[PDB]
Design a protein around this nucleic acid. Sequence first.
RNA 1: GACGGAGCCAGCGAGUCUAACCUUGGCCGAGAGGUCUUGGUAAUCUUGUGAAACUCCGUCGUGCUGGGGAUAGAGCAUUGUA
Lengths: 70, 145, 51, 53, 143, 78, 124
Amino acid sequence: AQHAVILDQEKYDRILKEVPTYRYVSVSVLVDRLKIGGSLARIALRHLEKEGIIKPISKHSKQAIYTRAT
Amino acid sequence: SLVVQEQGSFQHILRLLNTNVDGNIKIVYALTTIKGVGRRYSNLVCKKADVDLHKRAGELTQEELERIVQIMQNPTHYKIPAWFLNRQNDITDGKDYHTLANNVESKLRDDLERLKKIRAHRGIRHFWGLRVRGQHTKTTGRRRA
Amino acid sequence: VLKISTRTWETYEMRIHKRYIDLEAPVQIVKRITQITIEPGVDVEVVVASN
Amino acid sequence: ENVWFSHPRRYGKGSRQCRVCSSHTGLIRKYGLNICRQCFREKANDIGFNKFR
Amino acid sequence: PGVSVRDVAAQDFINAYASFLQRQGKLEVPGYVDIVKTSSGNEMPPQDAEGWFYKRAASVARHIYMRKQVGVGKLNKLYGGAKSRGVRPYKHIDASGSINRKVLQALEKIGIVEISPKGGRRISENGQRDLDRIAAQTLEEDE
Amino acid sequence: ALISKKRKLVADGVFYAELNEFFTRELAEEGYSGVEVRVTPTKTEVIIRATRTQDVLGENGRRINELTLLVQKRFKYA
Amino acid sequence: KKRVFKTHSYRGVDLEKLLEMSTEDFVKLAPARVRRRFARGMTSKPAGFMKKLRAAKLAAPENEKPAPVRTHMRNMIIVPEMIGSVVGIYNGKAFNQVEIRPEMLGHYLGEFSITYTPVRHGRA
RNA sequence: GACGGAGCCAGCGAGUCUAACCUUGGCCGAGAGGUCUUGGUAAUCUUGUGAAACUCCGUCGUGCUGGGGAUAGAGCAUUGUA
């Protein structure tokens, strides 16, 4: 737990303003942007796949690929 | 789960059961920083206290944490079935305590301490800097003392 | 197939050959075919109707 | 007429013998031929545990 | 075309049938649910804490459709696993016999399973019925 | 009987071993060359193939009597 | 002062009702090891020991320590019947004269006789 | 990669008579274990040894950590005269 296993309001808004141009988003991506850890990185992946922005083309946890909605 | 939007309700490090507990990680293993409440025990406390398991320690408004406090020093009072404990049929009052952070080692102490009231070979094997569970001291365990 | 580990190590094995021939037969020639053709080594088991 | 001559000899390594040579040590107990392993190596043709392969 | 639960993949059926018996409410979740280990070859209690019993009921039901019979000890041999022996490598142990036996009694109470002759549990006619029916449901939700 | 066939054949081998070693120790000065065991109905024939079997036959019923008796009384044979 | 202090408790049972209760109620509330010990072996285990034990407890020199009652039953659980008596315990030699204490209940006599002079690395 | 579900797969094998081996099944128990039968002297039943490594679905998120299971305690039981 380096940081951000909680959501700290401005982080998800900075995600919505910083996932354009992300060709590559996943669990490890939402960790490695100096951001949300793998517990609720899955939550923000589920909540951006909830509407619009990221589109999935693979399958399971430990291995994902989600994209910009183009 | 889901994005929630929570506020200064998210509060970092707090003291429950006489020790300080880190925030923003899962309550089940936040409580395993506390002595006497193991991973199984803290998991079952977070289940039986009607607590969402998936939350952090940063969550958990005070009622659920106070009920967790109330559970951990009252095990069979809130139905922990006494196989799930560590000090069954105690040694003096004969009850079933789940002893806690500043108690469990103390009661652990008491077990070892009463050996010096009895003179059994257990305490005799304890005193010399050895292993009381009978395994060999000839070859293994060489970083010892 | 049976194996025998033995002690610089060592191993043997084994051979149980077991068959059944069913002769639904009169008792006369059963008694004849069991008294005749005796032989060293072979075990004959003469059991009766399939129950 | 003697009352003190026996420990329980029903189990343990002393509970049996090699039928050739009294041995507790090396005794084969698979299929109950009850031979010590060195005499097993010797009498394995007399009993018929042959080296086949 | 016709369906069977052999005709359906197992995992998505078992999720749908766990949710289906959740809908049903015919449970027999004796009372020691989630204070229990559910398999002696494991350490921690299950993660969902409201259920794991419908999951196991679904697994036992489909596994009994696909087989002649299994017993209490056969489900212990199935849902047991390799528990770590710590300083020593792994080894397989029969699971908790109570939990699997109570799943058998639960599915017997609903008429999803029946105590088999030769020993064990056969799938019941209502068991075959309900399994193949919501297996058709599990396919037609993915059609 | 009630003997597993594995144990049956191993026990038969043990019996032939006791035959071979015992009749080796016994009839060595008759030039013992071998036993063979042939069970028929009503008989179980241990044949002493040897060089000097007239010293085995005995005086008009002797030591072959006594040898069958030794085998009889040890092995509980009728 | 009026309070004669208190007695210790074995597992929730004080000494005054420990000594004058039984062997078998004690091994009831004694743990699974002692309960498994006295569940089997019902064929009078402290046989000569109890008779000589009570004989020296009655031959005790007027509220002094009783005479030594020597045995090889290292595996004998101290039961509240023998509290206040004197037991001689073997270890290879060395019959250790041991007072049975009120608190000593539930454990083996062989735990009270050390079977070796310990290690002495060097120590000339 | 831990953790739990969830899929659930081998071959080499060993098995009790003038006794107490493999154990199915069915209950009871988180369990340990216990109970009661049942089959197998074994291509017959244990056993199709439904083995794990493996596959899916996430709880974890890079943290002597949920990795690792050293220490240690108390209880329950089984092996055995102990």
